[PDB]
Amino acid sequence: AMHPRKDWYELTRATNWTPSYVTEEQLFPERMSGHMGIPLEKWESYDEPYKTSYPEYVSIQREKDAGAYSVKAALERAKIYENSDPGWISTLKSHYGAIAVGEYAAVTGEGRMARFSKAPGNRNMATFGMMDELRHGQLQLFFPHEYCKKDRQFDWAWRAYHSNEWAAIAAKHFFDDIITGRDAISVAIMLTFSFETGFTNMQFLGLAADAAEAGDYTFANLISSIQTDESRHAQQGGPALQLLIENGKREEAQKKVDMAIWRAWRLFAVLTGPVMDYYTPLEDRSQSFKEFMYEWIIGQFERSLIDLGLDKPWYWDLFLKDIDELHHSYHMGVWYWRTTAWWNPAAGVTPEERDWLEEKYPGWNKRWGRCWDVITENVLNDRMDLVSPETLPSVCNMSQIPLVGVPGDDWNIEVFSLEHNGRLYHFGSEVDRWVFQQDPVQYQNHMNIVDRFLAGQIQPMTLEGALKYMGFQSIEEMGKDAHDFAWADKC
């Protein structure tokens, strides 16, 4: 007979002990552990709500992979690469480039907890977490690898995080801040709670919905399978949050969540935003970016944060306004500077798309529409020189993304600047400036790509020079309009 897990589970996490040959602080140094002075004994009350055990994990994960790979195999001849809209193909290129090696980096966030968390249950669940992120990194390299032979941009599934390309710097600056660059408890709160119950549902499930509409079941099935792991290991965050609150650290916990959510938001708005409202073909847009945000971030995540005892962030209303406006400008920036991307941005401004944008964001045409009007007229006149840039955008010193605002009929743009230790920094929001001020030692001597350009690190100081510095190896790899401007024919 076999004995049920409930009867022996406690023994698997009865692993704390009182050190005698080194000190507790030597074994769990604050800079790596992040215990905030909460004594060893208090951490033993940590109770992961989504448990598993080694024999079950290997069996269940064997099954999950068998399904993901069989589906890929059975659909290799569905002609997705050949028959898909180029906007959908660019969505795949963006996703795999932005995600695969970042998932692998997440193994280190989990390893940080597995070694340095004082909570025994956290150390075990983080061991499964290390394994889960290994899975995610490997899947999201194996899957796009077949497309290397079709298109050099898919090399970036592997190459991006090794480059200084501007979007890869943005991704790395965020993930190095919340995943690999902080103590174990910060990882539990910023990564597993904030990012992983907060935003990854958007990129993995919201995008899966659009993928299924687009008829790409290999991809939809993959990313939704990945998120089933997340749903388990993300549950390391809540009990850590609850433990900090019970031990007098609510304010610290709140600040970490406020920071992580905002940082996630800005990157999400530049990567997932344009995918959902512009690259995905109109007929495949299951919901708008804003609608998904309201389902996943407002309706689900923010409600769960309140249930666990935290408050709505101090920047709530700013966040809501950003959801209406930011990604429209981020898309415009990515598109106008498309040659610096490793995917081919779709403009997404045919009349029928502009009508959808107007319904989903009333006032769109009198704002972003005004810029797209100028762009469209230049395409129709074959003045293509006027739709490629001859300077660099100014870039946020926190998010690493261009400084933007609302264009057109009620123009409004604001940079939030800061003098600090003899240097002038510029931030794309009040919250980004605040994140800097929360932990200047984390950020102060970092130089963004424009800082580097001005410092003489990028030679020559031209478009070509920037493109070489960003790691492009051939003409094909540089982003172009997804449809070769064929959308202008509908205008």
Binding site: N378, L386, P393, S394, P407, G408, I413, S417
Partner: protein, 82 residues
């Protein structure tokens, strides 16, 4: 000599790096920013382009040079119409 600014042009969607000269007048500075905005993402219009520190209420005189203005390199300016 070279003098980088970050410039926001009226009705555009972003702030851009624009390198001007220390001894450029505000009129010359406005035209250097306009190059990267007007007829690219912003409709041309009649009127006089003026330069101001970002979101300031006061405009720099048209004939004032960058050197005379007290601006520091990499400070943010707006270019707006009278």
């Amino acid at each position: 000599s070279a003098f980088p600014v970050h410039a926001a042009f009226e009705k555009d969607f972003l702030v851009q790096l624009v390198v001007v000269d220390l001894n450029d007048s505000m009129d010359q500075v406005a035209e250097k920013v306009a190059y990267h905005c007007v007829n690219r993402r912003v409709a041309p219009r009649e009127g006089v382009m003026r330069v101001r520190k970002h979101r300031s209420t006061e405009l720099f005189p048209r004939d004032m040079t960058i050197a005379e203005s007290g601006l520091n390199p990499t400070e943010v300016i707006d270019v707006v119409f009278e």
